[PDB]
Amino acid sequence: AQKSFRIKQKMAKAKKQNRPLPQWIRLRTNNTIRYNAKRRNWRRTKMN
Amino acid sequence: GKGTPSFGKRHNKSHTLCNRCGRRSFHVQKKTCSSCGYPAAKTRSYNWGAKA
Amino acid sequence: ANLRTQKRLAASVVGVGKRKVWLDPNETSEIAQANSRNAIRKLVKNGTIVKKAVTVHSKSRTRAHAQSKREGRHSGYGKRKGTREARLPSQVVWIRRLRVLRRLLAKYRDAGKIDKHL
RNA sequence: CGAGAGACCGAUAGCGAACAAGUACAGUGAUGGAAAGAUGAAAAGAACUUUGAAAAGAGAGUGAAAAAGUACGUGAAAUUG
RNA sequence: UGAAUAGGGUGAAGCCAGAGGAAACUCUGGUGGAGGCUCGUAGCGGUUUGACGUGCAAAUCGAUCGUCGAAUUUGGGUAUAG
RNA sequence: CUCUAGUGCAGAUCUUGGUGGUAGUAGCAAAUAUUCAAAUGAGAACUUUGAAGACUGAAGGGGGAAAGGUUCCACGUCAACAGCAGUUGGACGUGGGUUAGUCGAUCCUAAGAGAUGGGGAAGCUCCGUUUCAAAGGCCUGAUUUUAUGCAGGCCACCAUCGAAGGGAAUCCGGUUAAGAUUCCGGAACCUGGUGGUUCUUCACGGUAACGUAACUGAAUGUGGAGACGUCGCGAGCCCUGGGAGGAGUUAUCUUUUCUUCUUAACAGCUUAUCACCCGAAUUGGUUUAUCCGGAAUGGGGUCUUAUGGCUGGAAGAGGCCAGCACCUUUGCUGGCUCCGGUGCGCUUGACGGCCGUGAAAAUCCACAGGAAGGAAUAGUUUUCAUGCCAGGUCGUACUGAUAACCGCAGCAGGUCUCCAAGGUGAACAGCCUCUAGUUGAUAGAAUAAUGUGAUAAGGGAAGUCGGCAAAAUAGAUCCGUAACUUCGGGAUAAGGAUUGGCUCUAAGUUAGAACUGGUACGGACAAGGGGAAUCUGACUGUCUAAUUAAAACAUAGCAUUGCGAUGGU
RNA sequence: UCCCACUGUCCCUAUCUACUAUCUAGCGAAACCACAGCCAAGGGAACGGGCUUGGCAGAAUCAGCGGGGAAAGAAGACCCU
RNA sequence: CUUAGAUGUACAAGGGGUAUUGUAAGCAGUAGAGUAGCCUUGUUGUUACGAUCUGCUGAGAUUACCUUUUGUCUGAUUUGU
Numbered sequence A: 001a002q003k004s005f006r007i008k009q010k011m012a013k014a015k016k017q018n019r020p021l022p023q024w025i026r027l028r029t030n031n032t033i034r035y036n037a038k039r040r041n042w043r044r045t046k047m048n
Numbered sequence B: 001g002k003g004t005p006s007f008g009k010r011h012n013k014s015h016t017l018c019n020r021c022g023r024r025s026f027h028v029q030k031k032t033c034s035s036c037g038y039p040a041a042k043t044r045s046y047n048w049g050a051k052a
Numbered sequence C: 001a002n003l004r005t006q007k008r009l010a011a012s013v014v015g016v017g018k019r020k021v022w023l024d025p026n027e028t029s030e031i032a033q034a035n036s037r038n039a040i041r042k043l044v045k046n047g048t049i050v051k052k053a054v055t056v057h058s059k060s061r062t063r064a065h066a067q068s069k070r071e072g073r074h075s076g077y078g079k080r081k082g083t084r085e086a087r088l089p090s091q092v093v094w095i096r097r098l099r100v101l102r103r104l105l106a107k108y109r110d111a112g113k114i115d116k117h118l
Numbered sequence D: 001c002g003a004g005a006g007a008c009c010g011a012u013a014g015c016g017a018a019c020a021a022g023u024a025c026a027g028u029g030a031u032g033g034a035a036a037g038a039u040g041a042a043a044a045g046a047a048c049u050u051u052g053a054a055a056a057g058a059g060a061g062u063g064a065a066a067a068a069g070u071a072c073g074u075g076a077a078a079u080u081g
Numbered sequence E: 001u002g003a004a005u006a007g008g009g010u011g012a013a014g015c016c017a018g019a020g021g022a023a024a025c026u027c028u029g030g031u032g033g034a035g036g037c038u039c040g041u042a043g044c045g046g047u048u049u050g051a052c053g054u055g056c057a058a059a060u061c062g063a064u065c066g067u068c069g070a071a072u073u074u075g076g077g078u079a080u081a082g
Numbered sequence F: 001c002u003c004u005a006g007u008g009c010a011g012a013u014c015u016u017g018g019u020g021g022u023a024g025u026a027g028c029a030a031a032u033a034u035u036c037a038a039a040u041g042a043g044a045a046c047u048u049u050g051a052a053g054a055c056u057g058a059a060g061g062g063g064g065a066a067a068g069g070u071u072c073c074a075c076g077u078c079a080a081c082a083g084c085a086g087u088u089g090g091a092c093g094u095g096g097g098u099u100a101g102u103c104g105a106u107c108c109u110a111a112g113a114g115a116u117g118g119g120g121a122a123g124c125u126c127c128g129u130u131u132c133a134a135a136g137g138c139c140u141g142a143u144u145u146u147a148u149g150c151a152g153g154c155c156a157c158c159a160u161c162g163a164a165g166g167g168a169a170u171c172c173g174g175u176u177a178a179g180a181u182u183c184c185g186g187a188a189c190c191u192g193g194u195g196g197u198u199c200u201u202c203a204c205g206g207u208a209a210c211g212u213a214a215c216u217g218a219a220u221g222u223g224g225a226g227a228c229g230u231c232g233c234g235a236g237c238c239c240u241g242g243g244a245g246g247a248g249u250u251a252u253c254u255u256u257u258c259u260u261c262u263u264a265a266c267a268g269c270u271u272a273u274c275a276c277c278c279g280a281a282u283u284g285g286u287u288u289a290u291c292c293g294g295a296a297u298g299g300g301g302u303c304u305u306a307u308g309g310c311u312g313g314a315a316g317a318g319g320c321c322a323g324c325a326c327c328u329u330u331g332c333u334g335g336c337u338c339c340g341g342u343g344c345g346c347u348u349g350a351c352g353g354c355c356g357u358g359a360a361a362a363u364c365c366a367c368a369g370g371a372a373g374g375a376a377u378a379g380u381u382u383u384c385a386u387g388c389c390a391g392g393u394c395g396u397a398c399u400g401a402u403a404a405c406c407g408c409a410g411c412a413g414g415u416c417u418c419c420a421a422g423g424u425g426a427a428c429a430g431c432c433u434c435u436a437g438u439u440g441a442u443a444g445a446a447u448a449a450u451g452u453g454a455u456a457a458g459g460g461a462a463g464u465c466g467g468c469a470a471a472a473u474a475g476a477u478c479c480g481u482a483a484c485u486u487c488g489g490g491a492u493a494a495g496g497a498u499u500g501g502c503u504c505u506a507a508g509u510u511a512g513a514a515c516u517g518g519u520a521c522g523g524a525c526a527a528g529g530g531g532a533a534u535c536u537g538a539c540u541g542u543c544u545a546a547u548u549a550a551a552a553c554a555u556a557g558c559a560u561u562g563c564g565a566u567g568g569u
Numbered sequence G: 001u002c003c004c005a006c007u008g009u010c011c012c013u014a015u016c017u018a019c020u021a022u023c024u025a026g027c028g029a030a031a032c033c034a035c036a037g038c039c040a041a042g043g044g045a046a047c048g049g050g051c052u053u054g055g056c057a058g059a060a061u062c063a064g065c066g067g068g069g070a071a072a073g074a075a076g077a078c079c080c081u
Numbered sequence H: 001c002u003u004a005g006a007u008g009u010a011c012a013a014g015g016g017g018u019a020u021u022g023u024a025a026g027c028a029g030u031a032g033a034g035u036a037g038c039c040u041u042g043u044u045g046u047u048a049c050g051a052u053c054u055g056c057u058g059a060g061a062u063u064a065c066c067u068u069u070u071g072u073c074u075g076a077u078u079u080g081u
Helices: A008-016 C004-014 C029-033 C042-046 C060-069 C090-099
Strands: none
Touching: none
């Protein structure tokens, strides 16, 4: 495909958010589960 | 069966995303938007778009 | 145990495909140590990265059969390329066989071998 | 935005949500959207010793109590010795 | 509006020659052109039979069968909404 | 001490979740053999490497666009998580790499559509753009500069928007964890800044001549092009050899046996078709030939395009294969042959000949030749010579039958579309090897009943809704053959006979003679059943998306009626 | 439909072969939850393993096979509002 | 369930004998027809090449056969009120 301008940094935002769940979370809780809901996987979701 | 693998064509790409809201019925053809409008006139807040 | 880097790059530096490239099974240690194209092109100077083609596609059998068959042996009718007089189309081959009479006839009239009447 | 109160709840109630709940995710898609609370006075969150390969298993220290040991309230049953 | 049918068989109409005929018929060869002429692949259609139906696709798979310069097949763009 | 409320559970094929059930049973992903040895390690069939075999090679080879978007890559981990192990992964985590005037991102014509203003009218919307607009030439005034730029006056001869068909440029090597028509090395081209003049028409000087100072914008066309149905015969475009280097095979034996090597942008040189050879006396071209050419005629006479070949670049570069240094890890240095028999590319819209009758446009061509008989010789609002800077603005990794697209899915899937070797068989069946690639997220041993493959005596349709299933036969070439026609037909009817191979006919298509054998000459592969009587739709064609492929409906053709189009509708 | 040659469809079945069943490892489905599970005669919500009498009926275990209960499932196809 | 376990034949394994399709490579020898090089020529002789021909011999390969020999089966586990 040929990409335009304002597609590129939406995709860059998505692949930056593809990093793990933040490790600061279970320093407040300590151990107890806090599970999350976004990132992106390559096979599965695309970006908006 | 007539359905799913035929829908896997999608050569004609209808909708892309909106700038202001995130309603992705922003058609390249029709330029419609069910939400606030893109392009708009006033903010298109419709009353039937809620139950409670 | 990854030599997957070495496997991939070994093909490209010699200029041969995926599977062909052979390696010497003795000194595999220095192959692993050589990551880059700069490094494994020193291994070409050793002669460990070589292709595995140990087949000759010898013309002996093919050229022997071609000489007998295209002379006029075996192909009476049994295995017979092109039915009798034909192969290429029967009409155009017949009319080309009559039009090569042009090439023979022509330079008699020109050449002054015979009179126009005759 | 602040204060006060009503015969007005105490994690299945009630605001979507008490807590990294819009965040690991799913749908092209205004959107749907779960799991999910927790020591003590002081963390001192087990030095040191000993066995095993890590897991796992025993002596020893800290501290008011370790009959409070980090997956940290009370605890039943199918499940399960 | 853009892309695709290799290979292989016949041939009226037009026009000429040669033997023959009162003359015309007849009758022997060459030159040559119009095909739902016609034939096999691309593109493309679905007659029979067996196994599946808590399984690979929410009507599936194997063996088997049709058309092709014609009312030919196909992609892309764009328009038509109860 | 008495008053008040969402006030007692077993149930609508209900409701909020865990857990039970078949059950550790089946499944464990379409039948492209696998055997053996190692590296590493806690653990090895799987990573990885070697020996060896199955397998495909019009793709298991190669390779671009849409769509997606960093999944590639190197680094780094074995926990969760992979239909199992697992030393492994796009899972997990971290960063890097993708360099254009150069490849795509533009004008105008078509399908088709947009922007703006007011009105007709109830909005939608149609309409205006078509005259100004937009664009260009000529004249005048004020200001300023190395330049410049602006305002006023004058010119009728044209007017909507969008391609895939119409509309810039390019080859080769080094190198990368990755890649360059991109970086980089070598050689090109496009875009602007430096040096040289030809005709209408005219002036001055000179003159058979030719030389030069004043001031010189410049082709909205007569008329022709860019411009579009179907269809046919030509005549040219290969396998292989020759010469040079190297080796005679684990086993009897082999140096005129096999294999490898055998090469190269551009410019200059200079060919088929056409037409002032229209015109036409004549006759080259299988030719029917009015035609066009050897050959001949005007007026004074000749020309364009262009497969291939010849020549230059290349002083130089590669390459079968070897010689040294030598620290023995590792690094360099030297070197051969070169030539002859042939496709569906391109050449041919002409020509041949038919109809359903062949588009539209910007840039651009088109814009009318004089001198010497021609010979010969030069320039052009054109072309040559020569110097310096700058090239916008992003996509650029990479997958593209896929782990990136796409079936919610690590699912037997959908999925535009590029390139074309040998011998055997028409081609692109089949046959089988190359360049070249590869057997999937569990395994061993026996191999019941039953469901999945073939063979055979005797019979020959006798069996079953059911000749469904299954059998006879087959090529090449010659002989022999049926009713009747809308005269376009039927014919491969029936009934019979023979092949390859080798020798010989002829020192070179192909066909005719001649000889033997076996189960059989098409020996794998491959390759028609026939006789006799009978219907309907003329023919080809359209069809019920998850139980109705037909007699339904269309079809070229024909008639009545509406009906003058400002129609009928 | 007649007619010619003929035919595993059958007579008539046998034999051999590919793959699995048997058996084993691993990980691991599926909708899925009546106390219960003999037969002959007898009464009867009307065709009983289940109720009355009488005859009969033990457990650890695996391979098989299509007769009942009437499986896997949808509020019947007839039939009327 | 029959059977073999060094003591002995259950298998494979080492040797001898017979049958299974029927007359091989290796080695030797014969008959008939055609062509070419070289030599001689009224004549012919010699050499080279391909098919055809003759002789050994029921040959070789060779299955579950008849007959006879070679290679292997400790511990550990573990039984009589």
